[model samples]
Target chain A: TPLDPALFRPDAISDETRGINDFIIKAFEAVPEWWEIGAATVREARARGEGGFPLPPKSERARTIEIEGKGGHKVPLRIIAPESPKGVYLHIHGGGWVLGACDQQDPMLERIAQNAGLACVSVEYRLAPEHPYPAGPDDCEAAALWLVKNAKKEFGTEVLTIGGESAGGHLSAVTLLRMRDRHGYKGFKGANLVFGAFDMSMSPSQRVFGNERLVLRTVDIQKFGDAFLPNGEDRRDPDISPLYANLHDMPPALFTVGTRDALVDDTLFMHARWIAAGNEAELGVFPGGAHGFVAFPGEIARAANAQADAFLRRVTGQ
Target chain B: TPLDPALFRPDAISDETRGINDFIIKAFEAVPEWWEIGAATVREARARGEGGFPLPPKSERARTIEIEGKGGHKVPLRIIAPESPKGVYLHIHGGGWVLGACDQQDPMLERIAQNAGLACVSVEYRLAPEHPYPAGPDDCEAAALWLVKNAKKEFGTEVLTIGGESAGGHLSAVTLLRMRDRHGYKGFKGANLVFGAFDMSMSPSQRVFGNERLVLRTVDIQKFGDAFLPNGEDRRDPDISPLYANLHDMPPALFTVGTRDALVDDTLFMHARWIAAGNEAELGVFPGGAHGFVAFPGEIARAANAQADAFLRRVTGQ
Candidate 1:
């Protein structure tokens, strides 16, 4: 109700945005436990339990592997392979850096492998409050480094790319930065960052514009950030908040976000910076779509992911 | 390229949004004069006195009529009818009160008539600059009044509603307010405000996010506002910017806006106020969609119109 009388965009009448939100809100309404996102996390932690969230139907060509990397910690990976693949797509799953597992993205990864015809690898990076900040980033970097070193021998191709949803998006971005500057490795080809919280410090969007039906709120956002960045860590560090990074000579990135997403400014600002840094960047901003909206089923989601798949095919020459 | 970073909705991401702008940038590249909206307006106005824009193929089932209005001014209307329609929908065509004509909405109006089984009335209200504030609103109010008083005899049903796009949306709000306060007309079943500019004095969204590529800009918006509310008029008048109105006991409203729309906040804020004012308001925000995107052909546009059709059916009980 505090919205100004004269402050609105005239071009905001497309149904594409409204339709997706309809689907999303319907999904939320259908699930009686949908509103319990915060409660589930709290209850599980109170019981000293780990997440047992339902996994999507397994991909026929999927397999799990654990490789020792960076301090000899075993990094878990779920690889969804296509026959006679031409490249590899390294994926990081999003759960605000606290929730979600590698298998959570199997449905999406398997599709990427099948449609784009690439070997898709899902990284099970460490979570926060137990292993925060550098731990998650380090694991992702190791997985990326391992993929860069082994793609040609393992997947029969050196053409490699990376992507992630939410926190995974944040990690994918940080991993790319680490690949370019930390290891002097620019072997990775492209990146797809969807609804990633690139700015831990929060944009105006993070501070406002979320609701129960929309799937985000400032309090939960702060809670998640606190968990991810424990010990009063520097949230502004480029390694953690990738939005603060010098985005140069990095990649042809595909950034996705919904008009209703809390992390919208993160992607929008990040994409602008990507372009400002003279790199090829494609951005998708869906109207009224929520965070992780790409993981849903609808015309807008299909259109957005199809574009991303097309980009993957073109970038990887698949 | 000249867009400000902070002004955009954080969530604006989609290949559709990006691709539309891509086409626009390419169009500008192809025609250097494309950037000069003012020049185009001036040239068109000079070449032909006012608004010679091409009309869609006339609907076979449509007819024209004129009636005397409040100030003894004649208001023209293009009515699209489906035989034995169960309800009537009053439509206000948009051009920021300064442009467009009644016949411009024939294609959309005809489709609604066929799809929703409703007779549609497109108002030919007076334009601004030539007949500024209250001129457009009064004419719309007149058409609305005529429909309210005559619907039972004219169409055999009093199940009436109102809708408008862009400037039409602004006028629709004013017409409704006038109906409630002035004429005691309370028969409007629903209102479909399509990316309307409810605020005449620039909105925060209007002030911030506008670029040539996405279509619509601040200067042009200001010019349109000036043309509509000339003579240094107070745009805050409830009859002008209805976003500031008391908004009590209004009919149900469906507000639609694209993520990439310049007037997105107008619909967002208006919908919020509609509900806050104890009225039922539905908001549809499209991802990666531009202003008037529903007029185009694509999955997004189709989905949007289908929803609008459904809304029409539900409200009119057809």
Candidate 2:
């Protein structure tokens, strides 16, 4: 892959060019020690990690998913009803900064709770270099401020939508820039930022990617941002880089990036400065693919998760 | 914008018989510097590159700017406080794997220094066959982790998101796995990833995607695993090409590529996956726009104002 007849850059080096940053670090760095080194190399092959796949049973499961934060953190949510409904999806997951559970990636959150007919809830926050900086998006903004403090007494469903990926896309851009600066736009309606990073740093494609595309270098990205901003003044703050905040009033955001990636020029300069500062954003680039494309068996992460579930059903049917 | 013809993805591609594994490249392998066989000419410059704004008021202005990365080398970098602040950007940059300067982008350097509140900064980096892996974010990770770490402390306000019209952002699968998982998180606050890519081998939207309508069709996605892994594992890792490391710790990144950047792949897989995954990347994706999305302002160079302020603060936060 080192075909640079003479050109390229990475802090300007030259032994006569063409190394292709070693091959992109080695190939899009995978974490959780790459799922504990592929579950310990599939438990050393001989079929030892015991079988897999089995979690479709349910008798309309749903008992209670509590929340009530500010001080007494308890956030542990889940609601998923809509096997026959049409709206509501809160969601949030992706564990770098710690781990991920609450039934890990539940089959793409049960295909966004049965195909956009929404009512899919999945939250179980708290993570970081060890529960750091406002404890992982403040436990995902106290589970989205407890579904806006209980949407119509828990799921009678009054139309809602939000999303996640990587620390839940920095808690969905800091809960939509703090509900568009305190509920000025009736808050929550749409946002996904899958692969998230709501702005932390270590991009430019993870500093000079090398071989096989890349595999997390830049000293494991500065030892994981010095153990999650070890006190580096939370790396300056806007709730930790919401593209350095202020997109006037924010919402209607859907992000994506993969042309190898380094945050693809910070999500293409915040999705072209949030649609030229007029808000209403939508971005998807995907080319080769890496970081969180996380495919196994069925490829293209299944056609980019069915094109992010058809752009979240036309941004929640407009 | 949801002219909802269901918006799209209604089983995507169509037209009739097509193959070649479908744009995933590799199979029809032939990457000899993306072949172009050039020829061009443009003159009439020297009003000293055009210097005319020192009218009446002044608080300080020591200017000097010249650019050309990759083989041309020639990279310097300036801008201290050019007058106090009224307007003057130059950030057109990206870092998916660039080199040299081009200040990366972070909410387009804090809403181009507080929207309408300008004084921008983008010095151009990532150059070589195309700033390989650390093609590393761009121009020193858009100035020390995106304009002094996440737009001068996450939107308290700064001013300098670069002159604009940036580059990179080809992005394959899951948008290059969400910019390789948001530039390897752990705290990569400042964002900028234009010419981003996922690996899908070659591109030109895969030789100009024919099927139309919902777009994407290089032949129907030619298999290598179709274009996500392979090529020794996605080109060269740093988490997938952060310009082969040593970018210190990361945060600021920048880019702007050209010379017809048709999926430059490995050589700058776009700044070697962010300076080999360390951060503080840069670039200048320019030379005749083919890959970096250079809008027609000068038809081959000179007035796109830093690539159009690195394209409106990487897509609207301006």
Candidate 3:
């Protein structure tokens, strides 16, 4: 077992003196708890259906139309009328397929929809551990089709953008591949992958057990895979591992990642494939960070936000 | 009659504010004590020699030279011999020629001598309203010549630079012209002038009176100039008003003025004539600041100090 980084290391001490040693050894500790709260605030803000809006008079944005669909499974969708929208993104959120719902992602969606000055249909995707693989991907595809057809009719958004994070990020990549290859979804604009796993290959992370990256210690990857899909131990299935899939004509994407994150390999592998396949893809790696970031997360989050914002400006095509 | 600028006039407030007057109108009282204290501090610092160096450890530099010259006037001189100096500047200070002295300028000289790594010999030239005209300029030229002949013996500084401020700025300009035409002194490497005046005529401040510009006041210029000079008003004497002097063969100069300063015209006039006469010169203008920077002395002083140090650098060929 590896020693916890939190433990004091003698080599890290400044100098060996009584008063100095006392100050260093027992005086100060900088534990990063506020980061989680920052992340949580972002998460809760997303959950409240506060995605995009117009400038001035914040009061006028309260009223919105909520869309409903099939399966008795309610997917709450809102219409944000920008003064003059350039496009729309059918965005999805990431929560390991079993966790996140759209309402929980409202804070993030509201900002995207509002600041991006574009119409947004934040997908209230069904969670897994129950609905599993094909189901979540299918619903996301259906939502994308609905957007491609109705954006002009309902909100007058001439252009379109597709995006999301984590599971939502994977779904976006998969949806683009599927649409470009099958459904004939083309000329539709961008994608934003906020700390997502583009590839789930057993790759070094799963193959080598202890002390590998991602900090998932004493956890079972094989079981985790099985829970997501039957016979899912095969981390390299092309559809399951998008990095193995052909990446042609896919829209531009910004995939953000924290260095210590377990799913880092997913982004790394996909980045190589997308670039090799001549698709427009950019990957951002943040050192000593975690799984997700909605605008640079934590202490150096400001730096991350700047990097991601620059990336977004590049890929956003605006 | 126009309201006295020295007196407060609330009725002269902006014309736009008459419709919605919010408070009782009032005028500020003039303080005779303000100028008194300002002049007093300059004198006190001169007497106390706050910026002067403490006694040198070496017996050689600690020695003082008092020369009783042709008129039985005791001319006092202090010298700080630095190790391996390249050159020296016989510096003069400006307080419209009434205030400031060599010792009073110790802080500035010490820093210039040390930072630029050169020897600086500041001269306590006689002030006006007491001893006028050629007295100040004559003392400066004599000191400079004396230093050139003996500087190598004290600190081994052979090269030379002549620099000053305000009225001293005027004197330095006059001396440079005189040095070239009369004594044929060519040891000076350059000159540094801050809030300096070179020409009495064609000055921007002398042409107009605005709220922003300061000093060079219409009421005080004649009084101060007369009180400082003799019965004959030699405004065009070149030393008292250097605008008439030829700048040929004058050392390279770094000159500047505050934009809001009344003497800004002086700096501009000097620089223009220097360049026109084919002399090396650089001019700097700090925007929206008052004369002598009494309003913001620290900031102006810093700028002035920096310009002076840079002049030393240019002079020493560093």
Candidate 4:
């Protein structure tokens, strides 16, 4: 790979993005790293309405339901669907396997449902430091399998797509692999992976992102990996790091990442692997974008989201 | 800038693009560099129907006319228009400032005229080494001024946009700057710059692209620059290298480049400067795309062209 580290420099970003990022960096400097506060404390703070990422107002179209999972576990699902939807979309929310909830992504899910005519079902999988490794992956797998078995009847169409951001992006990949390898299912039409962390072992960009703290740092990523896996479990195991897995026969995917993102290599390397494995893939690299930049308000974010929407529509045959 | 050199690696390209590029590399290796062959010999060969890049079949809609220029010289323009054009698009052809002609781009011009509802007028600017630098730029400026003076009377639309490929792209920028700085006209709506050489002093990518020749090499670029500018002329002169020019008040532009192109950094750096100058700019980086990749047959080229078309439409208010 000829990827240059210089692309991550502040000068590489647009002036508008640089200004927004400067403000973000100053704000982040004032707060403790989430890991420093501990997951439980952070969760409590969120529950107390004190701290957490700001979310859009909850969509009135959103509803909740419980679905049966492996071993008869009940998995909660937050769904946003248009009336007489044409297809179903399995969405996973990102918070580095720690923070974030499906309900917090109501606005994004609503956009997908309303714009693409695809019923959006977000998985409420267990977070790490508590649930750990297989726990979160297993729940996501259960959700994917449930959709595979019931989407046609539930949505009045069998067409399905899968997507997520950050950790959810990781889980979405894991679930796709499980569906193909364990159940021989290949019904999903596409994958919309946005700034996903595909390698639990950490790719080059992930390992040396330094402490500038544009949303994430090397320490936070390492801690997330440590908390998600058992103490002795290897990070490179294909089940844990999809980057190391067999990507053959995977659904067409649109991998989106910002040049300034710490996990930029995850999307870059994974997209290359996806295409090398004979799957169609499109890579969208946003100049000067940081981690989760798509969720931020800016022309770059809006452009990225619009491209993703167009990809979804194209993949779903809309 | 954080631009990664690894992004230019062959592995970074899609499998389909890799296959096509491998064929392209093989074909390119079998042919002598155009500079080695000498411009006159190459031009003679092209005139003799023995060599040169393959062009789409000529568009029947294309016609030629001559306009009075500075010093009362006659500048030929190849025109393609719809019966009722909504706007005018001024095009300059690319050939490293030594080759290519407006008539040679009939198919592309037809697409703009027919699809975008723009009266496409291509400048048959003077070539370099024979009529270098100010000569070509002068003709292009004359063309732009003529459009500003007569587009409404000739085409029934005053709306104007500018674009070109490679050398043409460089000329387009020069023309835009000339229009603003000298003529005091800012009527042009957008700039579609595809793989342009903005830095005559040579960007890092242009300087060290090495001789694995995928259409162009460092030596070829150096020669093109030397041929276009008079000896002893400073390459950093704002008039010669737009990358070093004042970019304030520039129209909205879409900078398109492939990762594998030697001019990648030109687009990368110019885009940053453009936004810093407070102009609306969009950067589209194609992974593993080589020089002139948009003119090649591939999914990447198709996608890039489609995006450019969309941008033109949006900027032209079509």
Candidate 5:
């Protein structure tokens, strides 16, 4: 399963996330557990010796392009341009910083571009273990800066935004910090951080879940951390874990998370910080949702997307 | 003298209620306390030994009508008819049951009539320290039953509501309980209880205020409760003290109070009960508002009024 099976099953929703209809409930329940489903898929891929994840078809709405980053690194991007776009929405994809690609989230980006009337540029940031820490954030920052600098010319507006789910959300935040501190750029208009793991130092919620497997357990979390921050790098480093970064002057943000998600507090704590820093911030919380619940097609996901769309529209004055 | 001077003065505002602009600030600061200003003009009536408050002016938007009650009591009601009323709003005047006439709050009732497209009937119930206990609630109950019986004929709709401020709020609650238990009537659609004192028994907030100089003092509170429930009557009587009454199947209610108000807990507790009883209840707690703060014409008051307006419209299907 590309997304968590529990996300599709409405009955799997925690009390806080209970709004899905019967059809969505049945559809999600039909899918197998993530551990077995992911293992089987990877086994087939390995048997075929496939080198990489599948890319979108040629007729895809977002076209692939490469923007050069630091040290001549080619930062691949999937760009979908809306007619008379209001601004650019820079998105990062989530897979624990190790799996998936930008095209995996094309449906979501395309929806944003079409509904919010904004250009969506999904960054194909580097994965971890092989290319850890700065690899993903570096690529994402390049795209953010590119949008900030070229948005008026490319999308006919200077307004820009950055958003992502899970690891992608982690990277979107880092990119904003890099833009503000490294380049002194604050042109980004909004940040839609969905179920993002903001604390590399394992949040209290992670302890509660402890190895209890709804999906993505504590062991998997440690593995992702090891892959992304190898050699036991300082988890408190503001650049690596943007939650510890100075949130002052951050643009208006929309943070969404599910009560059942291990990283629920990451979104909540970050939102509190965002508000404490005296900035516009909106929070949407779901009951019973697991990590990456937004990836599934359902009522809660639709509501979240609509909220993000409204936030983007309001910030862009569209 | 027509309104509470304390309601207009910005300097009298608590820290949380300090949003009135410099213009309003200066204008209100120029006024004296309500007791002094009210007494300054009421002096003429006192000198002439005027036993009762004056009724509304002839040019008043609302006209007075009398409905006979038990013991041959004449319940005077200030009726304001809209062009196409969606429902009848039965309003009880505030004053801790010792002060204030229905006409004294005509501006607020008129606003509800105009904004919510509802007919407003302000009950001129008897005051306390004289016509105590059953006198006030009895008159209010008469008006409530009148609306239940004649609202459709008077307003072209069967939708009815009961609301009030301070003692009026207590009376409204008592009225609803009386109707539900005595008459088995549940025709009222909504209750817009504004800064209403729900409990005659002292709430924790009353202890905190502790007679400190604000809009209303603890000593003053005790006096009102005494006047309304004299002869050492049962304060916990459901008709005199609504806090003890069963709240099940009550109409949808909108409860508004100021954070600094001595009766804040009344609104909160009543709302909690309304929800627990499986009824719709909306609550608005102004940051620094005191008792009868809704009488003030400002942003928070306006917002509360708008919220009340929306609830009325929705319940009445206006």
Candidate 6:
């Protein structure tokens, strides 16, 4: 079997991390689920403050600029550039397609830009339950195209890389395929996909993840899919689900996931498909890691971030 | 759905390692299959020399001695002990249950002894096809029991560890279970299982691994299973297939395997089960690695051996 029966059990989380996860889950118990609180309300609360989930303060190195997107619509780009960037990294933020903002991840972008010596561009793409489907993907594609056209002039480097976590991961993949198929551009050196929700239809791990509140829940993921693909769109549509896309001519990719993450299979299957399509793929599976575990304060997160930095530096020939 | 469709493709091996694997496969193409050449003939050839597979010369640090086993049978053990040893490691050699001897792996045992500061004891278990089923397991169990009883007296430490590769991995697991159930001994501190054939029924990877001549073929694995269970034994018997066993109260384990190895699933599933049973387990997966890839010269092998060495040392408190 591709997956072992043991994976379905709760014991997949190691004893060392289980109690920490339990504390995280219990902390989240008081907060309302996004779908329950309503996407708009959640967005407003997040925009007003930190939405009860605090994030690192914006870095002084980061600055925001408006870029023309599809149909000349303005899209916000959060840029974090090193003094002399060797490359430009197009980063997407993750929040199940309905939450998250570009500026919310300034600390992460600063680290990426500084560690890899790359100028980081975080796309402020449109979210679902409002713009939905093609909208978010369109803005991401527009950002990628913008980077391709202006990266050398803007950052003084032709080297380019793409990456994201969760929903951002899905958008990054979709953007890569669009770049290859539509724009005929394959300049992205590497993809750093961290705990991406690659399959909207739900993989085996996603389907069987149940109600455990370890950063995500099965119902919430389903709801995210419903919001993103509101008209009962084919979940397997390559545009919506990169897991079903023609992965040929793709750039080298790093797939990272925690064994305890509901989206673990998404990373696993995507990595396998990436390699099968004649692309270089690396899989970094962390034992006892929940979704977004890299954001947690621990050795696991440090190791994962170090790995990503090394990958970005190596791929960019730093 | 546990397995992804991409896994069945030949592209699982990375482009960097594919050429090296091709060269190795070409070199082995002329060698006769062990079953076709007759198990006895193959054993005789290996015993006489290196059997066309040149191994490192025996280490001067290793010595051989006979110990009383089941029914007073004299079981020969090849030993490598470090000065002021802190623990003892019971090692088993893999030759598909029909080939190999204790002395064939002196270099490996010597390294384990020196690196882990543990006395290494390589078991000379009876080969199958001549002595099938319980014979090999019986010899290994006796060796383990002897070590448990005599470790402190002989090595000045009661700390013990068990490990092996391939068929030896299977036998080591069987011996561990036997010690726990038959003799009520759970003193073995850790298990280092490398690409073990935990399921005699053949895991999905094993069943689907075609004739690639990558150190092993599907048919050869089947033949090995048949020879070891010549009487048409039920492959799922917990004693024969430890994958089906109740793995509770087992020691910490390191499950190592190559992505390209047919036994990859065995390690994956076994590691998951080991953790599910509330035991500590670590999994090391090497990309583009074939069966017995650790014996091949490459960075992958070096990384794998280093990981294994680190695991042994950490578990033994070295």
Chain B alone vs. reference chain B, TM-score for every model: 0.88, 0.35, 0.75, 0.95, 0.83, 0.93
Q: Could you give candidate 1's per-residue lDDT for residues A170-230 as a string of tens digits? A: 8899999998997999767899888888878765457655456555556668878887887
lDDT at B39, model 5: 35
TM-score of 6: 0.54
lDDT of 1: 0.74
B134-231, model 2: which lDDT tens digit per residue? 33333333343344344444334443332333223322112223333445523323334444444433322333334321112233233212222323
Clashing pairs in 6: A2-B2, A2-B3, A3-B2
For residues A2-116, could you state the per-residue lDDT of candidate 5 as single tens digits?
Answer: 1122232346454434533323444444344324446436434633545332343433666888899878979888888888888888888887887767766666777788888
* DockQ of every predicted complex: 0.02, 0.04, 0.00, 0.02, 0.01, 0.03
Error of 2 at B46 (Å): 26
- The candidate maximizing lDDT is 6
lDDT of 4 by residue, B1-318 (tens): 223334444566899888877888777676655667778777667655565457557788688999987788899998899999888889998889988878876878777776688899999998878888789999999999999999989999899999999888899999999999997998789999988988787754676677787887888898888889867898877788887676767898988888778786577667655654457777677777889898888899988888888888989897
Task: Output the lDDT of residue A84, model 4.
Answer: 91
DockQ for candidate 4: 0.02
The count of residue-pair clashes in candidate 3 stands at 22
Among incorrect, acceptable, medium and high, the docking class of model 2 is: incorrect
lDDT of 3 by residue, A177-256 (tens): 77777788776666777666665544333333343323232133443344467643455555676755656676666666
Question: Looking at model 4 chain A, which ten-residue stretch has the lowest summed lDDT?
Answer: A1-10
Measure candidate 2: CA RMSD.
20.2
lDDT of 2 by residue, A108-218 (tens): 766766677777777776655655666766666667666776765666656677877655676777776766565544566677776566556544444445434343334
Q: After superposition, how far is residue A103 of candidate 1 from its true place, in Å?
A: 49
Taking all chains together, each candidate's TM-score versus the true structure is 0.49, 0.29, 0.41, 0.52, 0.46, 0.54
A1-318 per-residue lDDT for model 6 (tens digits): 223335435655467677778788888877887778788898888877754567668887678889887777799999999989999899999998899899887878888887999999999999989988899999999999988988889989989999999999999999999999999998899999999988787765676678878888898798888888999798877888887777778888888877778887677667755754457777676767889988877767888899999999989997
Summed backbone clashes in each candidate are 35, 284, 22, 15, 4, 3
TM-score of chain A of each: 0.86, 0.29, 0.71, 0.94, 0.83, 0.94
